[PDB]
Nucleic acid binder design. Structure first.
Lengths: 135, 210, 210, 132, 128
RNA sequence: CGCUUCAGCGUUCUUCGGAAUGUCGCGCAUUGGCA
RNA sequence: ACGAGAACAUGCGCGACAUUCCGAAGAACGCUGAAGCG
């Protein structure tokens, strides 16, 4: 897929690492209140996943490995949407900055390959799954 | 011995979902894909799916014996037109319905209008008590897509060709009203059959009246 | 005594399934595979299948004697071409149809697209009294694949070579208008023959006209 | 397996049978596996396994290709997902140790060990169907 | 080996067990067992039989032992799918004899089990 | 000024038949026999 | 100084001919993108 800062590998295992690092119990009223990425709820995660899913299925229907200019512009708008969502909610900003998602989509644009985009979608899917599992 | 070739077009009035397994789905993505020709990666209508829907429709139309467990138990016209495997009464199938591939005309038409071949539809099921809904995404063939079929009819008995083609047209009329592939109760699979030409490719039979 | 070699290609117009047993698979995995060459693991078209389908179609076209029971009772042209074993009338087979192998050009073409030569078609049977699906997975050779055949004709009688090759042409036309392998009635195994070279490898017979 | 138990097809049988409970209701037995694991969820997990198994079986080398290894990594993510969505699935995963096996097959990186795990999953689903 | 009530497992017992189950109605074996399911089980045992046949060593190798384990798994799966297959497997004790073959771990016992299976199929065909 | 839950579920996973058949199963020469 | 001495149980002969692993079989059955409203 790609590499984040300090040369750390980006894999599904690293997705579990990221989701567990920001996973804390923070029990309240004698009841466990699971907190992920400082108040990030599942709904925001699923909205971001669906944002991924659109261009995912668009690339999946495609045959050529090279990302068409339509996919390039879709990923540019994906960056725009990620920035806007991060600005709207502090939890989404924390999730994006911890998960290096925008760096990953920039790398996907740089590679201009179907395989890298699939790997990025799988990493995003992993993050969602792990978050659902630990919640 | 004559072989007659019928070639036409199948046009989807509504989105069509004929499924094919063996595909892993990303979370929130197409859970049930459509069957596609591996070569062109284009949607396809399987010959078996058309034959099964047509034979089933025709069998219901003619009638079913009570407690009809087997397909080999069918009307004599169905057994003769679509075949049989009954022990001691192994008949032959005079229909050779084949896979209807994605037409090139419709493919270029879709490429003009910047339309994807398959649409993605959002559905969900809501509990009538808890009012809790579980969502799904289904893949369907975009409406206005065209598939050209190829049905071979073998003339095993010359005298029965008129009756067999009457049954074929009855099945076509039934299948055009009925849906194909995914449930038509949900409105998936509406289709239209337009025949191009009927001609005896092999032999001396006269198919002009057909 | 001359030997004329016919060489060409068999193009898979619709997915081809030639059943080959002897395989155990995981629960829910592929149920019925195709015949493959063990050394290459690539799908094959047995010469037995080609010869049997061609002989059956040719015998049907020339005609079946009423109440025929065996293959040695076929028409004299068929016995002359494909062989016979009748008591006192053993006729040698002038046609020696060989196994058709997966073409190297088709293999490279499929490797170009990163496509598998065999597809797993997902089908089911809907019961007529319970309407419960029974699922099956059938391996098929992907459409767009080519098999290069190899046929040897033994010129035993110089007089009948033209008639024999006319019958071979008729049989190949019937097979093109028919299917090869299993499931063809439901749209499998449709093929096209592309003849590349008919030449007299052994002897001094003139094969220019053929 | 934990406690020094060895993963096996008989291990699959004992895992299925020890989690089996009659749970009679209104005089009618209602067999429950792994706290009410339905067979449809097992068939979905088996479908994932089927896809990865077809991919690896069509391969030639005993050492798994990166494409198979990627599917095994995805399989662990899918197992984690399904564990979270349904508690019965989580109980099944923790009892069977199938997720642990996926890590073990990756470390083996060979086709024979995968095939063994495929057979273990087959034993799990077969015994679940039999004891029902 | 041996069955319940001390009876002896052999081709004679194969004939005997195919006969006792045989019920006139059509000829019904083991409460509705069809020839096709029997031939599927025979296909499984035939794959294992070919594996062993090709080999010459008397001791059963690891791969054929795993094949026998998967044979037991398939026996369980087919018993779960169909009641008649379960009845046939419990009346003929085929899975128990698979356990016995695994215990003995020799080519002779596996070949005898294959002969017993083949005799079951043959007498099932004969008594129909 | 949007927010949250739900993301697929339950259920079939092959079935039914054919499991080889028909033909040849050594012939001849020498030995023998008969002339 | 053996009922003995020589003396190839040998020569020609293709396990071969006729055979489609097919026949019958819908990946479909049910399933409101929806509930609360802060």
């Amino acid at each position: 897929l790609a590499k984040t800062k300090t040369g750390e590998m980006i894999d599904l295992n690293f997705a579990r690492k990221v989701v567990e690092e920001n996973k804390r119990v923070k029990d309240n009223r004698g009841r466990q209140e699971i907190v992920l990425f400082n108040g990030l709820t599942t709904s925001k995660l699923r909205n971001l996943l669906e944002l991924i899913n659109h261009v995912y299925t668009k690339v999946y229907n495609s045959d050529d490995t090279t990302l068409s200019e339509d996919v390039r512009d879709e990923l540019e708008y994906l960056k725009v949407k990620f920035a806007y969502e991060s600005g709207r909610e502090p939890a989404v900003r924390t999730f994006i900055e911890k998960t290096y998602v925008d760096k990953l989509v920039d790398v996907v644009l740089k590679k201009n390959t179907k395989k890298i985009f699939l790997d990025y979608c799988k990493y995003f899917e992993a993050l969602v799954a792990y978050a659902k599992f630990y919640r | 011995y004559s072989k007659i070739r019928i070639v036409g077009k199948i046009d989807v009035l509504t989105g069509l979902h004929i499924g094919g397994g063996g595909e892993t789905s990303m979370i929130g993505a197409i859970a049930s894909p459509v069957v596609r020709d591996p070569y062109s990666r284009l949607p396809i209508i399987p010959g078996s799916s058309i034959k099964g829907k047509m034979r089933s429709l025709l069998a219901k139309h003619i009638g079913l014996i009570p407690g009809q467990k087997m397909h080999n138990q069918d009307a004599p016209e169905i057994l003769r037109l679509f075949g049989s495997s009954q022990k001691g009464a192994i008949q032959s199938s005079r229909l050779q319905i084949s896979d209807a591939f994605f037409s090139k005309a419709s493919q270029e038409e879709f490429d003009k209008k910047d339309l994807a071949y398959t649409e993605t539809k959002f559905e969900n099921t809501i509990s009538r008590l808890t009012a809790v809904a579980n969502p799904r995404q289904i893949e369907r063939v975009t409406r206005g897509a065209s598939f050209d079929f190829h049905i071979i009819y073998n003339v095993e008995n010359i005298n029965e060709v008129m009756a067999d083609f009457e049954n074929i047209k009855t099945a076509i009329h039934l299948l055009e009203n009925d849906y194909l592939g995914g449930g038509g109760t949900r409105g998936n699979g509406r289709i239209r059959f337009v025949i191009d030409s009927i001609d005896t490719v092999v032999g001396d039979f006269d198919s002009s009246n057909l």
